[PDB]
DNA sequence: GGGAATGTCC
DNA sequence: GGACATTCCC
DNA sequence: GGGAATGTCC
DNA sequence: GGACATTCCC
């Protein structure tokens, strides 16, 4: 039958979440294949159906139990953290440019989360699959402002207080639910939602852009063991490592690692390390390698900086 | 006439203000003579009176006025940010062990300040000195029964807005107010309040003690102009200099300055600078000097480090 | 984006 | 007490 | 918020 | 030695 697919995933990394105090106008969420010269944005497509329809986007959590997220989508076609776009009559590909992710503060998570649940229990933005599987009246179609019961209050409150402690504010996922026209019911044919790849906040320490601001020494002996002070952007003492490497024309690249313990990482912004030994202790002319920061957890690197090895 | 006297003042520096999240048991405010083994506490005494008396302690601002402070007092006999002790009926000296200072969130200064300034006008806590000079309705002592008008509550609001904007969350002062029994039996006779010395939050960036953690080069030539990388603790870029001092004959401390712009302060934790030229460039023996961090604002220093000036 | 003040956690 | 994550500000 | 380190009673 | 404050110090 008819279904909804993700044509272009959102870019997992390199985008920064913004707080309410940071305002908007900090750029739109880019697509997985976006570039500076040719910009690209997340895109879905309605399959096995043509004609008018609507697609709603909303942030969900990242764990196994897909739950609502306290952050919000902001920008064009965005209200109350939910982005709604009408799918064209001819073109079924729905793009989402100028999208923004509003980073809600830790304090405001619970009240924001409990609000989203009470909104989805009335609007019908997938009530059971997100709030809790205990709410019975997953029936939606609208029903107007609907109604509230003093049992649903307890259910919503407990779901919110539970999902608050289970929520990571550094990673969100887009969820696209498509709605097709009904028997003059405007739009209420709920297609199964499609969760996108996890989006990681650029401001998070384990996802920020690695960079080597400067280095104490740019040349050292092949025997290694040379103490160097490296000034860098924010790193995590237990997660960072310093890699020298050279790309051999043979095919296999050589890599060594500067030696340091988490104690040598000074206040997340500098590293004192001893250099490794070059693979050729008995070299004739100086060899030219590069050095870079690398995160153990996800192997992200930094712009390499040159380095020279000398004979004895 | 009976008065109140501060026997031992609170130690002005070294004590760190704590937030609610940091919990209790992070130490009480030590007296000025307390030490690592002999631990004293802030203590006062009601002179020219003997009998049951009630002493209260509040936090007040350090500015050109004595306004109520948004921070709170916590610990034994502390409730609602106010400390209350009962001295007597024979001993009129009373100390305050386990008396910590709770740092209020910036986002809760106004509502806290306004709530306390309104309580000061209802019972006449010198509202012309603690709240606003316009509210000079000193209904002190036997007050407690006054409903504020719609104009006085607006003076309280504007004072709360203004004092919030000018409140220094890094310095507080203890105010001790003594109460003696009246003709009935309960404590009503309010003696002169006494303001203590100013307590300075050690955690403030404008008062955190400087420290040189590491240096890449422990020596340098006398000609100066050598690039040295220095790892330090949290310092402010526009308010830091590196001083090489030599204590020679009859004092005469030779001072050289490390050359660096504020942009060379790497993220408040590192300085890349150039050594100055030594006093006598023509020496022939390594001349031991010391190097330290100096805060151009108040000229406080760190623990110095040795640094040898070798000739050529 | 880059940087720091502010609040949190150990 | 030391170190860091979080939030704010430019 | 962990470790250590006392000082209780048991 | 165990439980249980109580404190001190990162």
From Swiss-Prot, chains A, B:
Instruction: Give the sites of the cross-link named Glycyl lysine isopeptide (Lys-Gly) (interchain with G-Cter in SUMO2).
Output: 285
Positions of S-(15-deoxy-Delta12,14-prostaglandin J2-9-yl)cysteine lipidation: 21
Tell me which residues bear Phosphoserine. 297
Ranges where the RHD domain occurs:
2-312
Q: Which domain of life is it from?
A: Eukaryota
What residues bear S-nitrosocysteine in this entry? Answer: 21
Q: Where in the cell is it found?
A: Nucleus; Cytoplasm
What this chain does, per the entry, is described as:
Constitutes the active form, which associates with RELA/p65 to form the NF-kappa-B p65-p50 complex to form a transcription factor. Together with RELA/p65, binds to the kappa-B consensus sequence 5'-GGRNNYYCC-3', located in the enhancer region of genes involved in immune response and acute phase reactions.
Q: What is this protein called?
A: Nuclear factor NF-kappa-B p50 subunit
Q: Which gene encodes it?
A: Nfkb1
First and last residue shown, out of the full length, are: 39 to 350 of 971
